[PDB]
Symmetry: D2
Subunit: 255 residues, 4 copies
């Protein structure tokens, strides 16, 4: 059986660390060619040194809040590997916790929407510039459980994660007529006072007995990137173990 992504070209924004690093590593294992677009042009190569000088991985410096940067990333990728088949919008931030809305600064608010929403739309816009004439492609954005439910995070974070789902569904509507799939992946809180946050998210988890790892989220992306999701679009794939579809506040099934 061939590798699930053999020959496909992928661009991953924020791939230098965190979930993006997992996605990049998993994509390579399944035969993909991957370009990382991330800030701090030193660190993206610094990660690239760790994984080696493979001729199927490349780094482009890109601030996803600048349209011309993301443009240069896509133009760079198609010049290395000849096309662009997968676009992963992983750049995302949360903002500081704010327990009282009366202390929520609009500057903090503005920054989160600039990165979480504007950055994702720019990625869709320039991936579309390649994928539409090819009549094929797969666009994947990393949302979180805050895309479907309130109270799971700060206001600007929750609003932006909802906005990403709305963009996903609307752009899925426009790009469906060209064969382009748009989807988003919404994870539960992932660890990495360490075992204290690790215990907390596990105690409030619906699914007990396994910990949500970064590789779990990556596996969801790999699915939506491959031809096994060939007819999947406009979908918010939850990797929350059932956290959002349930509520154990009345203690019907949990003590």
């Amino acid at each position: 059986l061939p590798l699930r992504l053999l020959g496909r070209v992928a661009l991953v924004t924020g791939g230098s660390s965190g979930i993006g690093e997992s996605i990049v590593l998993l994509f390579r294992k399944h035969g993909a060619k991957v370009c990382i677009a991330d800030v701090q042009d030193n660190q993206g190569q610094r990660l690239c040194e760790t994984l080696g000088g493979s001729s199927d991985i490349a780094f482009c410096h890109c601030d996803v809040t600048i349209e011309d940067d993301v443009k240069r990333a896509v133009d760079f990728t198609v010049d290395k590997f000849g096309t662009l088949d997968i676009m992963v919008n992983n750049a995302g931030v949360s903002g500081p916790p704010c327990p009282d809305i009366r202390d929520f600064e609009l500057s903090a608010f503005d920054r989160v929407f600039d990165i979480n929403v504007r950055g994702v739309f720019i990625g869709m816009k320039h991936a579309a510039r390649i994928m539409i004439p090819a009549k094929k492609g797969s666009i994947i954005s990393i949302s979180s459980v805050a895309s479907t439910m309130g109270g799971l995070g700060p206001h600007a974070y929750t609003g932006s994660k909802h906005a990403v789902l709305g963009l996903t569904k609307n752009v899925a509507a426009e790009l469906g007529k060209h064969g382009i799939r748009v989807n988003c992946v919404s994870p539960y809180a992932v660890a990495t006072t360490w075992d204290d946050f690790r215990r907390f998210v596990a105690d409030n988890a619906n699914l007990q007995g396994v910990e949500l790892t970064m590789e779990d989220v990556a596996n969801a992306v790999v699915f939506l990137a491959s031809d096994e999701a060939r007819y999947v679009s406009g979908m918010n794939l939850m990797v929350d173990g059932g956290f959002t579809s349930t509520n154990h506040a009345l203690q019907v099934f949990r003590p």
Copy 2:
């Protein structure tokens, strides 16, 4: 007979000079409320100001909802006129030009829509909260649209912002529930605010509910409901006024020819 449904309540309406906001203001006033309009362009702001008359239970404050200090002055003005703030209506909203190809969507156009639709709504929540939290009572209502739940019903920036408003509504409802404050949003179907007849026929043909046309007063009635004590335990709700448009899909012609 029975008392008026909003008697003695103070309301602030952003964008009340025209359109749906004008209906909300007029309906609120019919049910006994005191209303302050916050709207831009004092030329249009005075335009309605004279239009309604000179009553001592209506007032106008000039406010660009994209400026936090403007909305701050609106709230501070209202509580100085009528003594408190019980209802906050975020009706300022824009759609943007139609754009059929994402490859031609300008980020400046994108930025403007989110500034007004999302940032303006959050600022309204933030400063209404500054009054309503110490009173331990209030009702915040935002005017979304059917684009808050379904894709393809409008441009990208519009659909994203309407989704963002629903997300803010639910999240702020989570924070303000502790204090007895209700946060909800109202999502209308397209309203026809010779080409008028042509758009009017188009939205009616694609409507789920036939034999009636969505008027501005219909949307206002939904707000009046969520503003009153008949919605005393309603919060976090996206009250659709779409006649079933979003909950159904007649593309397979099971029930429509």
Copy 3:
């Protein structure tokens, strides 16, 4: 200002007690003529004696699990008051708590779907028989928060409440072409009396107010009136934000 439901005829299934009793009382305050369809004539009229022997309220005995019973209710209401404008499907049960699915009896399962789903569909079907030629009407079903989220109740209950939402949306699709509105109302939970009262309030999103039966009734009155003349396919939550939020991570609640 006139009463919000003046001259309107309403049928309420399960209106002898609980939420249905409040819906009936509220409907009458707003000028409606109301027919109650409920079991146990010995009690169905006995409560109808406490309200009084008015000429704008009537009782018909009806097992909502029997199609011919619901049929006679609608035929009775129309013969009393001349038409049928509002149909309220309030008959609903939950079943015993079952903490382990391996002990869930299928007979218990069958009974809940018979009353909660089959009873609601029969109500829609025979209300439709009147409302379609009139080209007007409003059908309202009483769901609960279990219509949108799992874990808030037993399996058969949660499944049936989801089924009611699905029927509501699908029948809204068919009856929209005739001007008929279909909606559903999903309430939050309303010495064990007092200790249940504190428990639902502690886990409530909206604090400082308790969900009363009159609150749910007000939602129905809204969807029954012309103030909702363009509302259809809607699941109106009266849960104070309970289903749209989750305080398990203690972001906003301690």
Copy 4:
């Protein structure tokens, strides 16, 4: 790289034909052992002769509307292959089209809920009897787009598909504490005079153009939720509708 389901035991209700046949064939390609539970034991083995002879596939006659039948299916599978790791509830019917609710017979209504809802719950109940002491497993039900949107099918069908989603979420809540994943897969209409014309019709109203929804596409979704790549996926309605339910092209914003 090993096969994605190597050593896992799966029970598939309705596996003789349609989507279930593809799920069985795909599961087998990825190393799984499969038991088919389907009515009409005549045809039920006829497929088991169609696919071929194998010591990793088996057939049990089972009416999913009878609890004791499904019970015997699970007890049969565990005795053949030693455990039960995957349970697929594919048995499902739709009922005749009914354009006017005033002509909808309650007998027709009763039959659809008996098979679509009661059959699915029985499958969950008896899969749970095995999977809870093992502290592992994956339960997958085949819903359709009618689980999320009205108007896409008859009333009894749409109600039952909604009920299945509700059961999925609620049972996911109870079985999460044991490590058991419950999910459902909701496909768009699959084609396989009125063949090429129903096929041309669902494609015109599809959001995603240039690709036809095949049965193998739906099977791939199940394989995903059956494997350890969905190890933390539960309570999920995985749409395979190409974006059909998340969009609405009635206003012709993006489609002419």
